[PDB]
Scaffold this active site. Structure first.
Site, PDB file in Angstrom:
ATOM      1  CG  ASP A 164      -3.823  36.097 -35.268  1.00  0.00           C
ATOM      2  OD1 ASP A 164      -2.788  36.530 -34.707  1.00  0.00           O
ATOM      3  OD2 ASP A 164      -4.094  36.334 -36.466  1.00  0.00           O
ATOM      4  CE  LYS A 222      -2.507  40.307 -33.653  1.00  0.00           C
ATOM      5  NZ  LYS A 222      -1.492  40.399 -34.730  1.00  0.00           N
ATOM      6  CG  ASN A 227      -6.693  39.398 -34.485  1.00  0.00           C
ATOM      7  OD1 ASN A 227      -6.392  40.255 -35.329  1.00  0.00           O
ATOM      8  ND2 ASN A 227      -6.188  38.171 -34.485  1.00  0.00           N
TER       9      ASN A 227
END
Ligand SMILES: Nc1ncc(-c2cccc(N3CCNCC3)c2)cc1C(=O)Nc1ccncc1
Length: 320
Positions: A122, A124, A127
């Site tokens: 995940d 990003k 994030n």
């Protein structure tokens, strides 16, 4: 407790700000989602990462976990600085030196998991998280996959469409190679100011069959890390090497300047300390409008009698 505001509101979980006398961030997952046939794995998996990741500096650490019949609650340390996505709009493009700080720390964070067996997947701009001091932290251990690392290639088929690994789109077995590709997209966006994909199902095709264009303004070292990190071949890709995968990253000419033993103790100086706003630090962070008021949804009895709390056992008890 006393719930100050709602931070984020994904479909699986809701992130909301709390106090008890320190500020904390809480991710609440409803139990119906995770309690099923081979579904219990996501809550359990994230706990293991959180246990293994809380000691590390860059990956975010977890104060406490508690259980209610209707939901599972995670209490995570509040970071004041900001997310990169807001930084990227404040400053369209970041210097190569700033990217080396962030990207270097992120590669350390991923390697820790790689050594541990966990694939963030995940990765990003949102994030990642910034503290008031200017370091980085990675937020949502939710899509991670753990427990199989040496001599193990597994297909869980999770990714984000922009950050998705090309090998994964193909339906091929995915190693930790996806995570490094995500780094290069991150580094790309910060240095170039734009996604490498000139930014629905069209992205998957572009990534697999369209060329990546490095801005002419970019340093030749920068082009090579991007090219090697954003390489379509998992065996050719930088840092996906089975034996010598971290040293070549670490010894790449772009990241020669760094001292990674020194940076891991937070000794190295962040390029720009983030702005100091109210103790919460809510101003620097993005503000999403899904649900402005924090009211936990009222429970339905029929579900609640169906949920087995046997599965949700040993929660509230966190190992190292
Ligand atoms: N620990 C944290 N400390 C502060 C923030 C924070 C603070 C203010 C605003 C935001 N925003 C997130 C991005 N959208 C705009 C709101 C996040 C999040 C976290 C955090 O862990 N988050 C997170 C999100 C998703 N799964 C696990 C954890």
């Amino acid at each position: 407790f006393d719930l100050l505001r709602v931070i984020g509101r994904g479909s699986y979980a809701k992130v909301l700000l709390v106090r008890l006398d320190r500020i904390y961030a809480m991710k609440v997952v409803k139990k119906e989602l995770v309690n099923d046939d081979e579904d219990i794995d996501w809550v359990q998996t994230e706990k293991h990462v959180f246990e293994q990741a809380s000691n590390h500096p860059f990956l975010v650490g977890l104060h406490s976990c508690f259980q209610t019949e209707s939901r599972l609650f995670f209490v995570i340390e509040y970071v004041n600085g900001g997310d990169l996505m807001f930084h990227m709009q404040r400053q369209r493009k970041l210097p190569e030196e700033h990217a080396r700080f962030y990207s270097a720390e992120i590669s350390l964070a991923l390697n820790y998991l790689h050594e541990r067996g966990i694939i963030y997947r995940d990765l990003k701009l949102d994030n990642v998280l910034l503290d008031s001091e200017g370091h980085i932290k990675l937020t949502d251990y939710g899509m991670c996959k753990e427990g199989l690392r040496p001599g193990d290639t597994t297909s869980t088929f999770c990714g984000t469409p922009n950050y998705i690994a090309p090998e994964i789109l193909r339906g091929e077995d995915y190693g930790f190679s996806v995570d490094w590709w995500a780094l290069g997209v991150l580094m790309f966006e910060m240095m170039a100011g734009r996604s490498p994909f000139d930014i629905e199902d069209y992205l998957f095709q572009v990534i697999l069959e369209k060329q990546i264009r490095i801005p002419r303004s970019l340093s030749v070292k920068a082009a090579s890390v991007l090219k090697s990190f954003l390489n379509k071949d998992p065996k050719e890709r930088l840092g996906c090497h089975p034996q010598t995968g971290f040293a070549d990253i670490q010894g790449h000419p772009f990241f020669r300047n760094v001292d990674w033993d020194m940076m891991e103790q937070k000794q190295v100086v962040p390029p720009f300390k983030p702005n100091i706003s109210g103790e919460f630090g809510l101003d620097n962070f993005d503000s999403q409008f899904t649900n402005e008021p924090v009211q936990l949804t009222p429970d339905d009895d029929d579900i609640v009698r169906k949920i087995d709390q046997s599965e949700f056992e040993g929660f509230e008890y966190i190992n190292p």
